[PDB]
Amino acid sequence: TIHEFKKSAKTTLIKIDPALKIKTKKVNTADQCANRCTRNKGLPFTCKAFVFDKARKQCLWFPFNSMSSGVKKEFGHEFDLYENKDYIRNCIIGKGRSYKGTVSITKSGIKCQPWSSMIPHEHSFLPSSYRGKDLQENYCRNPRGEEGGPWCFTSNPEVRYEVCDIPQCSEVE
Template sequence: ILWSLHEQTGLEENYCRNPDGDEKGPWCYTTDPDTRFDYCNIPECEVDCMHCNGENYRGVVATTASGLECQRWDSQQPHSHGYLPENFPEKHLKENYCRNPDGELRPWCFTTSPDKRWEYCDIPRCSESDFQTSSSQSGRGEDYRGTIAVTESGNTCQHWSSQSPHSHSRTPENYPCR
């Protein structure tokens, strides 16, 4: 079981991946000798669940675990804070949605209650099967594990374990968890 789980989390087959955290998202080397690599058109998703501590959660829950409404991230009322969306574009601090921009235990938000500065949100955890079969991406797509193997321009992706037609160092052995 460990082997099969590991196999599903890395650079298997010729599926689009983002092993180096490229801000444009998942990509692959192509089978076209004239096009070394290209980005893949993976739809952005607003997930309904979170993985790990929810740092990549991009859902639209906007109330805390106790039912308080979340304060907008671009607002300083009723609580002033330093998590301005323009200063943290990679954290997706949109609207008043629960997020985890600082590595807390789970997503949270500042509340609209003057008496409660912030509170955790109640976001369900994703099952392992949700994670492995996702057909959409969140953030830069580093966690994308779907099976799209064609780039935006229509090129077929080269297998990650292949060195032809393009040689590279992003092999399953060098990037076991990507």
């Protein structure tokens, strides 16, 4: 069940609007948080994300995620944030500068190379060098808002980089 979630290590969320619902429970593993979140049983809201506190082995279930208004993304070595994919916009606006979904395949079907790897292709697009751009794993991203839309360095040495095939939000009715 944990695979329908995008994971951000060392991250938790804090509500700034105190009327937003939360629910917590001491649990054993992060997989058990995902299960309860996926089946949404016993939660007085739509679970959109959860955090696992690895220190206290506690789940925090939320009716919001990191893109929700009135919530902050904070660093914490004991936390892992898990965002339900159904609530991370899966289409692109303009050139997709703000795309944060989990698609990792190019238009012609090649698997993307992780942004933190220099083979097949060497580059200067490190996470460190692009704060806020979410250059995590091998996700299609568009850090500089360039023409093509989200793209990635391709795991095929013959093709340096190729755009992905993430649809425009305007594509369909």
